[PDB]
Design a protein around this ligand. Sequence first.
Ligand code: MG
Ligand code: MG
Ligand code: MG
Ligand code: MG
Ligand code: MG
Ligand code: MG
Ligand code: MG
Ligand code: MG
Ligand code: MG
Ligand code: MG
Ligand code: MG
Ligand code: MG
Ligand code: MG
Ligand code: MG
Ligand code: MG
Lengths: 134, 37, 146, 212, 23
Amino acid sequence: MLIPRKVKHRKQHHPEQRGIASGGTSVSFGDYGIQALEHAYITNRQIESARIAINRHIKRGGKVWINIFPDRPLTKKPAETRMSGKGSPEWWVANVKPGRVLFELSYPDEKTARDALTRAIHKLPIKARIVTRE
Amino acid sequence: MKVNPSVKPICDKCRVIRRHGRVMVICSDPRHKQRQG
Amino acid sequence: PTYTPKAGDTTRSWYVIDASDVVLGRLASAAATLLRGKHKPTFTPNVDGGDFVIVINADKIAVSGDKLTKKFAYRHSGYPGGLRKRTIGELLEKHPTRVVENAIIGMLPHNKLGRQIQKKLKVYAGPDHPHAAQQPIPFEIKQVAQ
Amino acid sequence: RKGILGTKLGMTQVFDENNKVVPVTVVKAGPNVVTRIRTTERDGYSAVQLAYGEISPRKVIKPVAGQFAAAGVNPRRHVAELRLDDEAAVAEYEVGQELTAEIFSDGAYVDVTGTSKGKGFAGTMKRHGFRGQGAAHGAQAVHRRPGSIGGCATPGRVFKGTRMSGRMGNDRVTTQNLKVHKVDAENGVLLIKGAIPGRNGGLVVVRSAIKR
Amino acid sequence: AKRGRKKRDRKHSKANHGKRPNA
RNA sequence: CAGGCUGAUCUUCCCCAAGAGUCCAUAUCGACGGGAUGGUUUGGCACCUCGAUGUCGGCUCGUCGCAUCCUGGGGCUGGAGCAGGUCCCAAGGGUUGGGCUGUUCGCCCAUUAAAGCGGCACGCGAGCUGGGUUUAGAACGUCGUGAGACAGUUCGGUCUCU
RNA sequence: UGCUAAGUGGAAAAGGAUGUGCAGUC
Ligand SMILES: [Mg+2]
Ligand SMILES: [Mg+2]
Ligand SMILES: [Mg+2]
Ligand SMILES: [Mg+2]
Ligand SMILES: [Mg+2]
Ligand SMILES: [Mg+2]
Ligand SMILES: [Mg+2]
Ligand SMILES: [Mg+2]
Ligand SMILES: [Mg+2]
Ligand SMILES: [Mg+2]
Ligand SMILES: [Mg+2]
Ligand SMILES: [Mg+2]
Ligand SMILES: [Mg+2]
Ligand SMILES: [Mg+2]
Ligand SMILES: [Mg+2]
């Protein structure tokens, strides 16, 4: 649960799904990251769930970047109601496309780095790959 | 034994074989026996 | 116009298959061509010109795969919960006549004429048959090279 | 596995060796002639055909008379088979052997087959042991009626073996076990414990029990 | 459910060329 | 109202284990997050029927599925024994009578080896009942100037067919 | 000329796994 400060239009269209990512497709910051190989709407729940899964498994050392930010409303209506207007902004959702690097990890060990990212793969909807800066 | 779609080893002794078209892991411990991995 | 049989034109005659090692299906389909009379130069669909077939060693048929456990061959009586199922290996031990028969009946046309075709078939478990008076010719099953 | 045809002679009660009452159904198995012995060579099974009961020669049909003439036996009322297991048991019968009720030996168990009493088109309540609808609290003309007989638009039919209404009894039935209290050798009667199917004077096939 | 899935998998028959008139 | 599609919500399993279990994630529970099954709840939609597809609960009669309540066969146990827990297999048979309510559900009572969960027009009114709902009478609270109105209570209320 | 042993062909996922055929790489 991290959210944008002041969004200009609180009710938007669906983020444009299909297409390959132009950038950032490669690792820019740290030694190990994870690159999405699929289209998904990564909710701010799923980022924070994946973020702590690294931080618990890594313990004290290293450093975690997040190239994702949610930014976008995605509307829901009440479950009671009949099918009037547009509903209220419920989620907060980053549009992810194949190519794009999501998370990043600076931890000096090889094994502790890779399996800590492997925790973050299972808590995202995407079917993902572990990448390296080299 | 523990069923479930996952198996995975726990002991290094745990063997992960497959019998009669079905995946299982056997360890010295009676506890680490699994199926349909 | 064309030729149609105006009776009697049926030469008929007999055949005798031995199964032994040959697989089910290609026995049964090759039997069913003889049973319709479709090998004949003269063939009209409305009449039956179907030659007699005696299948022998109908327990020996090599079914292949793992069908002798897993193929079930269902019946239903009429009553609720009347669905019986009977493994081919179990069915062949009890009734070795049935397995070659129930294959061959499934390949025939399924109509009023197609039931008159079923009289021409006979099917025996052992090597012997009691139609040795009529002198049937042994029909080995043949592919024509294309 | 021994057997005997006879008649149901009606019931009485007889007191035990240890002073209890046992209710006993009296049958009289008279002297039965084995007419024909079915053999595993020709027939494909083993069985014994038993003749029972006195009939006048003029009553007998010429087809039926010639079968008894082949046996060398005076014709009889009823005839029936005892099917018996294996080939070995028919070895000790000869055509014209007149067996009697003495064979059974006190304290045996039997099957005692016989056709039941006809009850003559009983519906629902008597036949199957249904419950009827209530006798009061509204109930319009349903007091012994079957009620529903099926679901609705699926399946849209009544199933086979639904329990309705029709002619009851004259079923062949069997008692099973049913201890023989006393073989009486003179007179030719067996006191068998408990009820045996059928009317008084109906044909009855007593044989030793397969379950025992 | 079962009937919903199966109708839309008749799309892939070879005669249909990966589209079948649903409704 | 029922069927049809859908499956947000419900429902039964499942992936990853942060953990709690003295220590020990996986005896037993399992947060956060993710993926599906089922069509049994509340819904969405308006495709069949308005020159009629007649109505909740109960009674009578059932029939099938297994996601098993009991009986039967197994693995693991933080299983001494007795008695359990948990998971796999298995649908042959059996799954009580009363109290209160129109009830379904539920709370209780005395038992029982056990008091299973569901589908079949929420099975079954050309098989039955009519207590509930839903016509006309009438009073009470409320809103209305009034005629009258209210999934607010209350008492009464034709169940056709060779 | 090859592949598939599951009747896969003749329904399905996140995942799990010394099933196997080819092309890479210490
Ligand atoms: Mg009564
Ligand atoms: Mg009356
Ligand atoms: Mg679904
Ligand atoms: Mg509707
Ligand atoms: Mg309809
Ligand atoms: Mg419409
Ligand atoms: Mg009409
Ligand atoms: Mg089961
Ligand atoms: Mg109903
Ligand atoms: Mg009515
Ligand atoms: Mg009706
Ligand atoms: Mg009323
Ligand atoms: Mg007023
Ligand atoms: Mg009155
Ligand atoms: Mg298949």
